[PDB]
Amino acid sequence: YTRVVWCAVGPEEQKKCQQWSQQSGQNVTCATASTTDDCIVLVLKGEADALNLDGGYIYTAGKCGLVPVLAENRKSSKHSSLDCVLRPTEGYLAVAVVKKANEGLTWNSLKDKKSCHTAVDRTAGWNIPMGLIVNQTGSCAFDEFFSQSCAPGADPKSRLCALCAGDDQGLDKCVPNSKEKYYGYTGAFRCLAEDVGDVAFVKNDTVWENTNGESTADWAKNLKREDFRLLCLDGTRKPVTEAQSCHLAVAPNHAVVSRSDRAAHVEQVLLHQQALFGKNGKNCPDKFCLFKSETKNLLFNDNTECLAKLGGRPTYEEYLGTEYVTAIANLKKCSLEACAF
Ligand SMILES: *[C@@H]1O[C@H](CO)[C@@H](O[C@@H]2O[C@H](CO)[C@@H](O)[C@H](O)[C@H]2NC(C)=O)[C@H](O)[C@H]1NC(C)=O
Ligand SMILES: *[C@@H]1O[C@H](CO)[C@@H](O[C@@H]2O[C@H](CO)[C@@H](O)[C@H](O)[C@H]2NC(C)=O)[C@H](O)[C@H]1NC(C)=O
Ligand SMILES: *[C@@H]1O[C@H](CO)[C@@H](O[C@@H]2O[C@H](CO)[C@@H](O)[C@H](O)[C@H]2NC(C)=O)[C@H](O)[C@H]1NC(C)=O
Ligand SMILES: O=c1ccc2ccccc2o1
Ligand SMILES: [Fe+3]
Ligand SMILES: [Zn+2]
Ligand SMILES: [Zn+2]
C-alpha cells in the first residue's frame, strides 16, 4: 500500500535495491529487469512503481504515459540559500572527451574514429552527439560514421558493439546495464581511458569524478585531468576546466518516473526515504546511503545531493524542454506518434 516497488536494471542495482529494501523495512521492495526499456514495461504493467531515468528514456516513457515525479539535484554555487528539495535543477553538460596525447583529433575529424557511448538512446551518450552528427552529415547512416564503437543496446554483431567487452567472463556483450564493462557515464569514460576508443560522450562531471585521485578504482587511480581534452563544436580543443564554453549541449537531469496514477504516492515515499538515506539522512553514512555505490552510479548518480520537487507540475515535454524534444524527434525519424511498446 504505502509500499513502493522500485525497478532495478541488472544484477548490481538489484543487490543495492535489496539492501535499500532491507533498511527501509519493506517500505520499498524490488523488481529487476535486464534493460531500462523492460523496467519501463514493468511500470506500465503496474508490476513496478518507479525508477530513475536519463532524459532520453524519459522521452520513451512519456509517450507511454509515465510522468516525471522528482529530479536529481547535484550541488550548486547558485541558489545555495534555497534548500536542495526546492532548488531548481541546473541540467548537466554533455561533452565529448579525448586523450590529449591524441594530437589533432577535433570535432571535424571524428569520421572513422573509435567511439564510446554510455548507451543507445541516452542523452549525452547518444541522442545529442548522434543528433548533431546526423544533422551535420545530412544522413541517417550513423551506424557507418565511426569505424568501431561500444554503444550498449545496439546489435551485438554490429560495429556499434565491436568495442564493448561484456562482463568478467565475456558474457553479456553490449547489454545496456552495468554488467557490460563500458556501460554508462563511467563505463564509457573507462573505454576512453584504456584507449579502447578515441572519443567518449559523457557529461562534464564524469571526467572530474574519475581523475586526480577522486576514484581509487584500479583503472582510474592514475588518471590526470590534464591528459584529457574536450571537443568543442567550433573545431577547437579545450582543457576540461572549460566545459561551460565547450559542451555539445546542456541536458535535463535524470529524474524518477512513475505511472501518473501512482505519482503522488511514490513522491511521498521518496521524500521520506531520502530524509533517511539521503545526503544528510538520519541513517545514511551509518547504515545505508541511497546516493553512493562506489563510483558505479547504481539506481542514482553518485553525485546526487537530493531528489527535488519539480514545480510547474511539468508534463514530460515541459520537463525535457522543446529544444531537446525536437532533437530526439528528428533523430528518431532516422530509425509516427505512439508508445514504442
Ligand atoms: C515506513 O513508512 C511509515 C509511514 O510513513 C513509517 O511509520 C510512520 O512512522 C512515523 C515515525 O516513525 C509515525 O509518526 C507515522 O505515524 C507513521 N506513518 C504511517 C503512515 O504509518 C515508518 O517509520 C517507515 N519505516 C521505515 C523503516 O522507513
Ligand atoms: C538537428 O536539425 C534539426 C532540424 O533543423 C534541429 O531540429 C530543429 O530544432 C530547432 C531548435 O534547435 C528548431 O528551430 C527547428 O525548427 C527544429 N526542426 C524540426 C524539424 O524539428 C535539431 O535541433 C538538430 N539537432 C541537434 C542535436 O541540434
Ligand atoms: C563540471 O562538473 C564539475 C563536477 O563534476 C563541477 O565542479 C564541482 O563544482 C562544485 C561547486 O559547484 C564543487 O563543490 C565540486 O568539488 C566540483 N567537482 C569536482 C570533482 O571538481 C564544475 O564546476 C562543472 N562545470 C560546469 C561548467 O558545468
Ligand atoms: O525543460 C525544461 C526544464 C526547466 C524549465 C524551466 C523554465 C522554462 C522551461 C523549462 O524547460
Ligand atoms: Fe544522462
Ligand atoms: Zn550551451
Ligand atoms: Zn505545465
CB distance 327 to ligand 2 below 6 Å: yes
| Close Cβ partners of 57 (under 8 Å, ≥ 6 residues apart) | 36, 37, 40, 121, 122
Residues with CB under 6 A from ligand 4: 252, 319-321
Q: Are 84 and 61 in contact (CB under 8 A)?
A: no
Q: Is 137 in the pocket of ligand 2 (CB under 6 A)?
A: no
222 CA distance to ligand 4 centroid (A)?
39
Pocket test for ligand 2, best of 201, 330, 336, 337 (most atoms within 8 A of CB): 330
What technique was this entry resolved by? X-ray
**Is 124 within any annotated ligand binding site?**
yes
CA 237 / ligand 2 centre spacing (Å)? 25
Say if residues 206 and 239 touch (Cβ distance below 8 Å): no
Cell numbers for 309: 520537487
Which class is domain 74-254+317-327?
A: alpha beta
Find out whether 267 and 70 touch, Cβ atoms under 8 Å.
Answer: yes
Q: How far apart are CA 194 and CA 169, in angstroms?
A: 19
- Expressed in Å, this structure's resolution amounts to 2.6
Cβ of 215: how many Cβ atoms within 10 Å? 17
Closest alpha carbon to 251 in 85, 79, 59, 66 = 59
User: How crowded is the C-beta side of 208, counted as CA atoms within 13 Å?
Assistant: 12
Work out whether strand 237-238 and strand 92-99 pair parallel, antiparallel, or are unpaired. Answer: unpaired
Crossing angle (nearest 10°) for helices 55-63 and 322-332: 80
| Cell digits of residue 221 | 587511480
**Could you tell me the three cell numbers for 96?**
565529448
Give yes or no for residue 326 CB within 6 A of ligand 2. yes
**What residues contact residue 81 under an 8 Å CB cut-off, 6+ apart?**
none
* 295 marked ligand binding residue: no
Tell whether 217 is in a known binding site: no
Q: Is the dihedral of CA 132, 191, 291, 224 positive or negative?
A: negative
For ligand 2, say whether the CB of 195 is within 6 Å of any of its atoms: no
Helix 322-332 with 128-137: angle, nearest 10 deg: 60
| Cα gap 256→54, rounded to integer Å | 9
Domain ranges of the chain: 2-73+255-316, 74-254+317-327
* Architecture of the domain whose range is 2-73+255-316: 3-Layer(aba) Sandwich (3.40)
Distance CA 311, CA 193 (A): 39
Give nearest CA residue, ligand 4 atom 11.
321
Which atom of ligand 1 is the closest one to the Cα of 24?
27
Among the bound ligands, the one closest to the CA of 92? 3
- Ligand 1 contacts (CB < 6 A) are 2, 24-25, 27, 272, 276
Which ligand has an atom closest to residue 93 CA? 3
Q: Measured in angstroms, how far is the CA atom of residue 180 from the centroid of ligand 1? A: 38
Å from CA of 299 to ligand 2 middle: 32
Pocket test for ligand 1, best of 1, 2, 274 (most atoms within 8 A of CB): 2
Q: Is 118 annotated as belonging to a binding site? A: yes
Q: Residue 313 C-alpha to ligand 7 middle, in angstroms?
A: 6
Residue 326 CB coordination number (10 Å)? 11
272 annotated binding-site participant: no
